[PDB]
Amino acid sequence: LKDYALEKEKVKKFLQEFYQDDELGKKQFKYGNQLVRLAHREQVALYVDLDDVAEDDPELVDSICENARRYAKLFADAVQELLPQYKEREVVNKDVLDVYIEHRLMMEQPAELMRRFELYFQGPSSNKPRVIREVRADSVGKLVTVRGIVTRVSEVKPKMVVATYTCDQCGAETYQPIQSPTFMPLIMCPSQECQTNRSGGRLYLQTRGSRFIKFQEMKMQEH
């Protein structure tokens, strides 16, 4: 397998150096500009285009198309590492969830809780759309493109991403990142003071601190 550290540096190089002959050929480095907007919280999602990557490294594009999930995580971490370099400005406080984070910083002075951006791939122009019948089991885990008609859509629901608890006795806080479709919550304090004294303090979950994302379910059908 590849060294994902080397791949991380290659991705950083792409973000740092790529220009699409952009802004009417003025070569203003589209992804650098995007990183400025992301750093100043002007924008949330970032759609990286695989046709741009193909100009420098088609083998990287092929590496992405199979086992896409690894490269999703990789690109997200690369963007988080590069974001402070494109910052120059202090942003105004505008969200209760971030007021909690600000209090947490003030008291301190995991990264998943702070990572307020989304990263998605726009498919390479080589890949023609499949019909819903041709997405067979040899395509598990691979990036695909599909075409059809929508039949049903749900309302938008809050989906849990990381839970935040508080302890009645010791005044500390704890975190629990969520990935599977289900989880089991915490009960009793794992901090060293409570544990060593066996003082039995309980954990209360805080909807003012935990992180949520907009989630919706949909169905699509053959022509």
Partner 1 sequence: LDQEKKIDDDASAHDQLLWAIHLSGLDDLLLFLASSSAEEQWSLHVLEIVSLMFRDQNPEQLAGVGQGRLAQERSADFAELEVLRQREMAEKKTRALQRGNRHSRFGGSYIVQGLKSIGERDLIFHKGLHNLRNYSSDLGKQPKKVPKRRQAARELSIQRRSALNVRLFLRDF
Residues at the site binding Zn ion, with contacts judged by CB under 5 A: 167, 169-170, 189, 191, 194, 201
Nearer to partner 1, 36 or 97 (CB): 97
Cβ at position 169, least distance to Zn ion in Å:
5
Residue 197 contact partner, candidates partner 1, Zn ion, none, CB within 5 to 8 A by sort of partner:
partner 1
**Distance in angstroms (rounded) separating the CA atoms of residues 113 and 206:** 14
Nearer to Zn ion, 34 or 166 (CB): 166
Residue 189 contact partner, candidates partner 1, Zn ion, none, CB within 5 to 8 A by sort of partner:
Zn ion
Cβ at position 160, least distance to partner 1 in Å:
18
Cβ at position 163, least distance to partner 1 in Å:
16
**Distance in angstroms (rounded) separating the CA atoms of residues 182 and 160:** 10
Nearer to Zn ion, 79 or 189 (CB): 189
Residue 206 contact partner, candidates Zn ion, partner 1, none, CB within 5 to 8 A by sort of partner:
partner 1
Is there a contact between 131 and 147 (Cβ–Cβ < 8 Å)? yes
Nearer to partner 1, 33 or 199 (CB): 199
Is there a contact between 27 and 100 (Cβ–Cβ < 8 Å)? no
Residue 107 contact partner, candidates Zn ion, partner 1, none, CB within 5 to 8 A by sort of partner:
partner 1
**Distance in angstroms (rounded) separating the CA atoms of residues 91 and 89:** 6
Residue 171 contact partner, candidates Zn ion, partner 1, none, CB within 5 to 8 A by sort of partner:
partner 1
**Distance in angstroms (rounded) separating the CA atoms of residues 37 and 137:** 40
Cβ at position 164, least distance to Zn ion in Å:
14
Burial class (CB in 10 A: 0-12, 13-18, 19+), 150: exposed
Nearer to partner 1, 63 or 199 (CB): 199
Residues that bind partner 1 in the complex, under the rule CB under 8 A:
107, 166-172, 191, 193, 197, 199, 204, 206
> What is the phi/psi pair of residue 221, to 5°?
-130, 155
Cβ at position 194, least distance to Zn ion in Å:
4
Q: Which amino acid is present at 112?
A: E
Residue 190 contact partner, candidates partner 1, Zn ion, none, CB within 5 to 8 A by sort of partner:
none
216: its two tokens: 């919706």
Is there a contact between 155 and 172 (Cβ–Cβ < 8 Å)? no
Is there a contact between 184 and 177 (Cβ–Cβ < 8 Å)? no
**Distance in angstroms (rounded) separating the CA atoms of residues 60 and 166:** 44
